[PDB]
Design a protein around this ligand. Sequence first.
Ligand code: 1PW
Length: 200
Amino acid sequence: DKPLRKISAAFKKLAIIVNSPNPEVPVTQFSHACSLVSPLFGCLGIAFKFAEMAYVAKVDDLVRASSSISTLVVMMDKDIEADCVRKAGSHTRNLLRVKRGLDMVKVLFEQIIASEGDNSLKDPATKSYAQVFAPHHGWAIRKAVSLGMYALPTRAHLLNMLKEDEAAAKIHMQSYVNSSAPLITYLDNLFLSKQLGIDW
Ligand SMILES: CCCCCCCCCCCCC/C=C/[C@@H](O)[C@H](COP(=O)(O)O)NC(C)=O
């Protein structure tokens, strides 16, 4: 089906889990949902090429992890026990970056919705990247991203690539925004509650 619909369906499900008492988020289900977001970065063009190493490789690792590890909590606790939380390539470091990817797409969608009537994606792309990723990327990446903003598809072109009209895309984006918000909060709080921080 259409990429935004796959996304909204999968995250609705995740929202139910996190909004319930004693949530257990399976690594399989979380990593599959996160993989549905990947095609979005590609639709945005060269500006978001960083997403392959920054997001896709990370989801790939969680996909791998999911065969032997039950939940995100158990996954994090294993890395804590092994004292390898901030190590390059740890599941937990990867989870934190995946969280940022989910957040950037959330903010992007919010801004696209807020700017209905402007056929340019420049502000929404620039704003969300600035809010979510800019504080963690080095100079060269930030400069490259900014330059790549001239290569964004128009708003109408993007809708066409995602195979939706304005009304339908609005609903599915809003749905992801509503679903992903408590998930992102859930994830932040796992890090915060285990005294790991979220700014590294
Ligand atoms: C012919 C020219 C082709 C143009 C180049 C295409 C875009 C290149 C953008 C590459 C972005 C690389 C980002 C690297 C990802 C991670 O390995 C690295 C470290 O991963 P980490 O955040 O520590 O887990 N992340 C950062 C932002 O330093």
